[PDB]
Design a protein around this ligand. Structure first.
Ligand SMILES: *[C@@H]1O[C@H](CO)[C@@H](O[C@@H]2O[C@H](CO)[C@@H](O[C@@H]3O[C@H](CO)[C@@H](O)[C@H](O)[C@@H]3O)[C@H](O)[C@H]2NC(C)=O)[C@H](O)[C@H]1NC(C)=O
Ligand SMILES: *[C@@H]1O[C@H](CO)[C@@H](O[C@@H]2O[C@H](CO)[C@@H](O)[C@H](O)[C@H]2NC(C)=O)[C@H](O)[C@H]1NC(C)=O
Ligand SMILES: *[C@@H]1O[C@H](CO[C@@H]2O[C@@H](C)[C@@H](O)[C@@H](O)[C@@H]2O)[C@@H](O)[C@H](O)[C@H]1NC(C)=O
Ligand SMILES: N[C@@H](CCCC[NH3+])C(=O)O
Ligand code: PRO
Ligand SMILES: [Cl-]
Ligand SMILES: [Zn+2]
Length: 603
């Protein structure tokens, strides 16, 4: 570590701590930036050499965090919690946590290399028949193929190709991650992740939330299973059993909007899937981003800077380069460079993703002048909710009409049901999955789930919550959790469950602030500068203040609350409930053991 990056001398009182924090900040931007840059160079161009460079950058980051971490502990570890500047408390709090910097040198290297190798495995995995990539090839098949056998080949091929080789590395990563964070005072890595929400009752609170949301999920599930039964027959669909995991339009069955055309209750109404219109109008990735950008500026939030357009990767490279296609938003910590890396496809659901990612960027733009340690969301769920809130307005038939993607719908009860169903397939279907992923990972981190039970416990949770079953037999050679991006890429997941609840709280508060007075689900906050000012306040706060306070200022409540979500969906909730009772549906999957047979002569 260069002497210019070393911590100097500071007094052991609150005054000296302010100077310490300032000095940290003065050096941290350079170190964080070199690391984000190397990560970028790798993720947009996966090679052995770029991985080597990224790891080298990661090592320097760890060295810097060690030097300043230890100095913070030495000087302030007792007294810092009693400092009366809450922002300073948060900075010191952040700096004293070394994470992987706690590992001895050889283990830091092992850890850094594991991250590289798991990332490589997931993002370069292919299914050969030459060979299909996840994005766009297998994504497209799962989205639009209605051949049972073809869907199965894609689902099984993907889970096999991505999951199996990840398992040994993931075991090694879990052990090292735990060793690292134990030194920071946490029982395991999961405990560290959960600490970001600063709630002694976090897990209970999520459980209570889910209890309220579950009946909506059960009704949607029963309704969709009925349609699937009509399409695929009694051989492949059990009306009292879990749904085969490959039939819901999505590799992870995490969102079901791609099977909308199968379940659209009133087809004679205008087609709410505007994809073919985007295609006919010649929309490209770049136009999707401009359209998203303009919504932000309509709220008097920030446009994307030139560095964003010049630096971002908005399409899958045509040069055959290997990239991490999974959409992400990047803060380079230099207050100038902000980027999105997305293998953008021209679809309606991709348009929503563009908004999601740009929500992240907008947060970055708004809090770029805070000290580095405070450049985070009020909690990670806040960061995930921003773009989704705007996307709720964009999805409304009225907004789609405003932007030339839809002919004015008859504002009647049946148009409402269509729309709320399409939204339910996207938002309600996700809830059990958003909830279960970190439950699996928390179990792994605590040792409750050893490698010998990785798949057993994954499918337990997948069945328990989503009511799905694998369409082919799985065993512990398979590592099906590994075939979902966030696991090998070590990105926490509970943020999304939190987000999916919170975004409806945001939507309600912003719509009220916008002076809108109709039904919640028909709200469009486009061009509300009052709604923009309210959202801006949240964004500029970063992690400077307790999330409960920031939420109170915004929404009038200091807690996550399912009621705004329920109010938004109430009409389709009622309707689905009636369709299910009239069809004599069983709510749930009491034949919990059931799996479908193989298609004739597979493969
Ligand atoms: C589509 O049609 C629905 C009717 O099914 C319209 O919803 C209605 O919108 C009006 C006007 O915003 C609402 O009246 C308002 O009531 C509040 C008090 O509740 C009052 O403070 C306001 O002054 C205003 O008069 C009405 O509540 C609402 N009706 C229902 C049943 O929700 C909707 O406006 C139409 N949407 C579009 C986009 O054209
Ligand atoms: C992808 O990454 C590789 C490195 O793994 C890049 O290859 C280097 O490019 C520089 C600058 O043009 C050359 O001078 C070097 O000879 C290359 N270095 C090595 C170690 O091979 C490559 O340019 C990157 N591709 C793209 C499209 O950015
Ligand atoms: C786990 O299963 C592996 C392959 O699965 C088998 O073949 C597929 C196509 C299905 O028909 C399935 O029922 C079969 O089990 C086996 O190669 C492997 O031996 C199994 N691993 C262990 C550790 O038992
Ligand atoms: N970043 C969002 C969108 C993912 C898009 C998948 N390629 C989550 O994760
Ligand atoms: O794709 C995923 O898994 C998460 C959830 C929605 C946004 N990104
Ligand atoms: Cl999180
Ligand atoms: Zn996100």
């Amino acid at each position: 570590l260069d002497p210019g990056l070393q911590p100097g001398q500071f007094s052991a009182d609150e005054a000296g701590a302010q100077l310490f924090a300032q000095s940290y900040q003065s050096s941290a931007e350079q170190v964080l930036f070199q690391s984000v840059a190397a990560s970028w160079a790798h993720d947009t161009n996966i090679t052995a050499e770029n991985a080597r460079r990224q790891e080298e950058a990661a090592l320097l980051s760890q060295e810097f965090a060690e030097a300043w971490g230890q100095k913070a502990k030495e000087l302030y570890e007792p007294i810092w919690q009693q400092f009366t500047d809450p922002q300073l408390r948060r900075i010191i709090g952040a700096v004293r946590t070394l994470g992987s910097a706690n590992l001895p040198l050889a283990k830091r290297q092992q850890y850094n290399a594991l991250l590289s190798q798991m990332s490589r495995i997931y993002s370069t995995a292919k299914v050969c028949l030459t060979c299909w990539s996840l994005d766009p090839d297998l994504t497209n098949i799962l989205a639009s193929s209605r051949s049972y056998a073809m869907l199965l080949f894609a689902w099984e091929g993907w889970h096999n190709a991505a999951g199996i080789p990840l398992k040994p590395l993931y075991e090694d990563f879990t052990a090292l991650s735990n060793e690292a964070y134990k030194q920071d005072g946490f029982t395991d890595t999961g405990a560290y992740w959960r600490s970001w929400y600063n709630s002694p009752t976090f897990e209970d609170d999520l459980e209570h939330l889910y209890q309220q949301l579950e009946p909506l999920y059960l009704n949607l599930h029963a309704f969709v299973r009925r349609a699937l039964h009509r399409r695929y027959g009694d051989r492949y669909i059990n009306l009292r059993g879990p749904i085969p995991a490959h039939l819901l339009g999505d590799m992870w069955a995490q969102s079901w909007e791609n099977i909308y055309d199968m379940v659209v209750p009133f087809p004679d109404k205008p087609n709410l899937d505007v994809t073919s219109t985007m295609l006919q109008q010649g929309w490209q990735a770049t136009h999707m981003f401009r359209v998203a950008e303009e919504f932000f500026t309509s709220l008097e939030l920030s446009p994307m800077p030139p560095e964003f357009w010049e630096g971002s990767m908005l399409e899958k490279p045509a040069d055959g380069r290997e990239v991490v296609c999974h959409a992400s938003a990047w803060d380079f910590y230099n207050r100038k460079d902000f980027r999105i890396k997305q293998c953008t496809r021209v679809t309606m659901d991709q348009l929503s993703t563009v908004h999601h990612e740009m929500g992240h960027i907008q947060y970055y733009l708004q809090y770029k002048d805070l000290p580095v340690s405070l450049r985070r969301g009020a909690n990670p769920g806040f960061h995930e909710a921003i773009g989704d809130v705007l996307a709720l307005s964009v999805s409304t038939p009225e907004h789609l009409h405003k932007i030339g993607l839809l002919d004015r719908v008859t504002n009647d009860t049946e148009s409402d049901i269509n729309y709320l169903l399409k939204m339910a397939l996207e938002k309600i279907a996700f809830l059990p999955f958003g909830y279960l992923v970190d439950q699996w990972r928390w179990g792994v981190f605590s040792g409750r789930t050893p490698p010998s039970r990785y798949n057993f416990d994954w499918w337990y949770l997948r069945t328990k919550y989503q009511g799905i079953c694998p369409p082919v037999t799985r065993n512990e050679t398979h590592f099906d959790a590994g075939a979902k991006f966030h696991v090998p890429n070590v990105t926490p997941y509970i943020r999304y469950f939190v987000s999916f609840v919170l975004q409806f709280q945001f939507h309600e508060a912003l719509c009220k602030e916008a002076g809108y007075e109709g039904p919640l689900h028909q709200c469009d906050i486009y061009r509300s500068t009052k709604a923009g000012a309210k959202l801006r306040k949240v964004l500029r706060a970063g992690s400077s203040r307790p999330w409960q306070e920031v939420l109170k200022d915004m929404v009038g409540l200091d807690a996550l609350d399912a009621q705004p979500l329920l109010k938004y969906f109430q009409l389709v909730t009622q309707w689905l409930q009636e369709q299910n009772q009239q069809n004599g549906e069983v709510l749930g999957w009491p034949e919990y053991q059931w799996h479908p047979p193989l298609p004739d002569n597979y493969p």
